[PDB]
Amino acid sequence: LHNGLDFSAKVIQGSLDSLPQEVRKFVEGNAQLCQPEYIHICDGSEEEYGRLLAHMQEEGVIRKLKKYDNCWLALTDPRDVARIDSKTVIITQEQRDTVPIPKSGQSQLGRWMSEEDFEKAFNARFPGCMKGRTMYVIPFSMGPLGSPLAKIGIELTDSPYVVASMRIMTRMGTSVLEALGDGEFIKCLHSVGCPLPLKKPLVNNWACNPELTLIAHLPDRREIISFGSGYGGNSLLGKKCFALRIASRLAKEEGWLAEHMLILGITNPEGKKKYLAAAFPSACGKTNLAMMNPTLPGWKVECVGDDIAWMKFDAQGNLRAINPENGFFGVAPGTSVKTNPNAIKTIQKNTIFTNVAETSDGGVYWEGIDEPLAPGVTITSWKNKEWRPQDEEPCAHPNSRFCTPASQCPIIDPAWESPEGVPIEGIIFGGRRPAGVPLVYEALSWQHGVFVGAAMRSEATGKVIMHDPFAMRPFFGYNFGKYLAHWLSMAHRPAAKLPKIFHVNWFRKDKNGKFLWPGFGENSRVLEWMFGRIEGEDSAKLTPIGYVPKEDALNLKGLGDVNVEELFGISKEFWEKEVEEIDKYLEDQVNADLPYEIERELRALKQRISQM
Numbered sequence: 001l002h003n004g005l006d007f008s009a010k011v012i013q014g015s016l017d018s019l020p021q022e023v024r025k026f027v028e029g030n031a032q033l034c035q036p037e038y039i040h041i042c043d044g045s046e047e048e049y050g051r052l053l054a055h056m057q058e059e060g061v062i063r064k065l066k067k068y069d070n071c072w073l074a075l076t077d078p079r080d081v082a083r084i085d086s087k088t089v090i091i092t093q094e095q096r097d098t099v100p101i102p103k104s105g106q107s108q109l110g111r112w113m114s115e116e117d118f119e120k121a122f123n124a125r126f127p128g129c130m131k132g133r134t135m136y137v138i139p140f141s142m143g144p145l146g147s148p149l150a151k152i153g154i155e156l157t158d159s160p161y162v163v164a165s166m167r168i169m170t171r172m173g174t175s176v177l178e179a180l181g182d183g184e185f186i187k188c189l190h191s192v193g194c195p196l197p198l199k200k201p202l203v204n205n206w207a208c209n210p211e212l213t214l215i216a217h218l219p220d221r222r223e224i225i226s227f228g229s230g231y232g233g234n235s236l237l238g239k240k241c242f243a244l245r246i247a248s249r250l251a252k253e254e255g256w257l258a259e260h261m262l263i264l265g266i267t268n269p270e271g272k273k274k275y276l277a278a279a280f281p282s283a284c285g286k287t288n289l290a291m292m293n294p295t296l297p298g299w300k301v302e303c304v305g306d307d308i309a310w311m312k313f314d315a316q317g318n319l320r321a322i323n324p325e326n327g328f329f330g331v332a333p334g335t336s337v338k339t340n341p342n343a344i345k346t347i348q349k350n351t352i353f354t355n356v357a358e359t360s361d362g363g364v365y366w367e368g369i370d371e372p373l374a375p376g377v378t379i380t381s382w383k384n385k386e387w388r389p390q391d392e393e394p395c396a397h398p399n400s401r402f403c404t405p406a407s408q409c410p411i412i413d414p415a416w417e418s419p420e421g422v423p424i425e426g427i428i429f430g431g432r433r434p435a436g437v438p439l440v441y442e443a444l445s446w447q448h449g450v451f452v453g454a455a456m457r458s459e460a461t462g463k464v465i466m467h468d469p470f471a472m473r474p475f476f477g478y479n480f481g482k483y484l485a486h487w488l489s490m491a492h493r494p495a496a497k498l499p500k501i502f503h504v505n506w507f508r509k510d511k512n513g514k515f516l517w518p519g520f521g522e523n524s525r526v527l528e529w530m531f532g533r534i535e536g537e538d539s540a541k542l543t544p545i546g547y548v549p550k551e552d553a554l555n556l557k558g559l560g561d562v563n564v565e566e567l568f569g570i571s572k573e574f575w576e577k578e579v580e581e582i583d584k585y586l587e588d589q590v591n592a593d594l595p596y597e598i599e600r601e602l603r604a605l606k607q608r609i610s611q612m
């Protein structure tokens with residue numbers, strides 16, 4: 001009767017008419033709601049990318065890092081990398097489907113919001129929120145195009161930084177739209193929450209709305225709706241919202257697993273290769289392991305992924321894993337030639353850095369780079385101030401990131417994009433435990449291994465030790481007890497070849513606070529032991545917590561005087577306290593949804609400890 005709800009006049013790249021019907025409805029419906037000035041349907045081309053970077057550069061949104069080949073630096077409003085799992089929620093009809101109902105306290109395992117409450121929140125945020133801005137339409141694949149394990153999303157965003165970063169971290173553009181056709185997709189809606197004219201002053205040329213920041217997941221509607229943050233997991237909606245929260249619920253429904261795991265391939269000196277997955281929390285070194293440079297001669301490690309694993313048993317019973325990401329969104333501080341040489345070589349081109357320091361010669365700098373600068377070279381911190389080594393403040397934000405293409409990693413695995421995925425033979429859990437937990441132990445069974453994941457604890461970074469089951473505490477898409485049952489159910493599947501489960505601790509300290517294990521490339525010696533155990537080698541000693549390496553089973557040559565007594569010590573007094581703490585945690589936090597098999601493993605461990 002007038003123009004309908006036809007936004008064709010506002011399209012500045014692409015065509016609404018060429019979009020699949022349901023994608024068009026999603027775009028136009030949100031264009032009506034958010035009132036963007038323009039619509040840009042991303043094609044994923046190199047020209048689109050380069051021009052958007054130059055535009056952001058011209059506006060002061062990012063700076064070019066002149067030392068490198070096509071690298072860039074964004075400095076955020078410091079409010080936009082504050083703690084916001086308080087503002088991260090999942091909407092379902094029933095709270096219990098999202099989190100177990102705890103016995104004593106508040107839940108640590110997720111944060112539910114009612115549908116009613118969410119609709120009020122949404123109505124208070126999104127209407128007119130993109131006024132004066134371009135709505136970018138990002139078609140993206142999580143996983144290799146045409147992998148039967150891949151899933152597709154469409155992200156609408158008003159942030160060019162999100163567009164640039166999603167090109168790196170996902171497969172993005174016209175080829176995705178063509179692969180999608182009329183199939184299902186996850187609807188991803190994002191706004192920085194700063195319509196023009198700006199109602200509040202812009203800090204550091206970084207649009208955000210901290211007071212209204214809210215990151216919502218609606219698994220029954222296949223929707224992620226995120227408002228007010230331009231940063232990381234809040235804005236790149238593939239990264240955690242899709243990769244873990246939505247995907248874990250899809251996995252539950254469909255019979256697969258979505259996990260906070262690296263995936264690596266390891267080849268021995270006789271050419272035999274195995275793939276392993278490992279779940280460690282933030283600050284516990286997944287990215288270091290995934291890209292490891294092994295010290296043991298004749299061994300090779302190659303990287304499939306450093307953060308997310310989507311895993312499904314195939315008809316032959318093999319546990320096939322893909323990396324659903326297209327890049328590495330890695331913590332910058334602590335990355336050096338020493339700790340991650342392969343990362344150092346990946347990130348010197350075509351990489352976007354956020355919240356690190358800049359050197360006067362146009363390079364990057366951060367705590368732990370271990371790379372001295374020439375006299376006269378000066379440093380600008382992530383707060384855009386002159387910075388000196390003898391100051392209180394760090395030069396980079398402690399969780400600042402690089403965002404780099406996976407294809408550039410010099411040890412990227414030749415099957416990192418194989419659509420069928422890679423066959424996983426081992427799953428590793430671990431965190432930071434300064435006391436009591438040995439370097440490595442092996443679980444006694446699948447059920448025991450699921451308990452080991454469930455019981456994971458890690459020192460926060462007096463000190464505090466917190467539970468982080470499966471390294472998924474921030475990320476469960478649904479009730480953690482039901483997740484445990486889902487894991488346990490894999491054992492009753494036809495022909496499943498259940499991988500061996502291990503627990504590691506890189507972080508045990510002696511009584512003066514010194515690390516007992518050197519770690520990093522030396523962890524290859526632990527992987528050698530795991531490799532042998534998967535192969536059935538008689539290299540294990542039974543203990544109350546699981547199997548540990550026999551005396552002399554680990555290759556310790558070249559390590560000198562490693563204190564093996566302390567590094568492998570298992571104390572009854574420590575483990576008595578441990579099991580009690582785990583018992584109380586699971587009772588409180590999982591309560592009526594704790595599977596029988598987990599409670600049984602808890603009872604069994606308590607019993608074996610009692611007989612020490």
Ligand SMILES: Nc1nc2c(ncn2[C@@H]2O[C@H](COP(=O)(O)OP(=O)(O)OP(=O)(O)O)[C@@H](O)[C@H]2O)c(=O)[nH]1
Nearest residue numbers: 280281282283284285286287288331334506519520
């Ligand atoms: N002592 C020791 N520290 C390690 C080792 N591997 C990694 N680290 C430490 O782990 C930290 C880096 O881990 P992150 O990159 O935060 O961990 P991540 O698991 O990749 O975290 P996300 O990217 O947030 O998922 C640094 O403090 C490293 O020094 C190791 O083998 N030994």
Ligand SMILES: [Mn+2]
Nearest residue numbers: 286287330331
């Ligand atoms: Mn990482």
Ligand SMILES: [Mn+2]
Nearest residue numbers: 260281282307
């Ligand atoms: Mn992570």
Ligand code: NA
Nearest residue numbers: 075076204205
């Ligand atoms: Na900035």
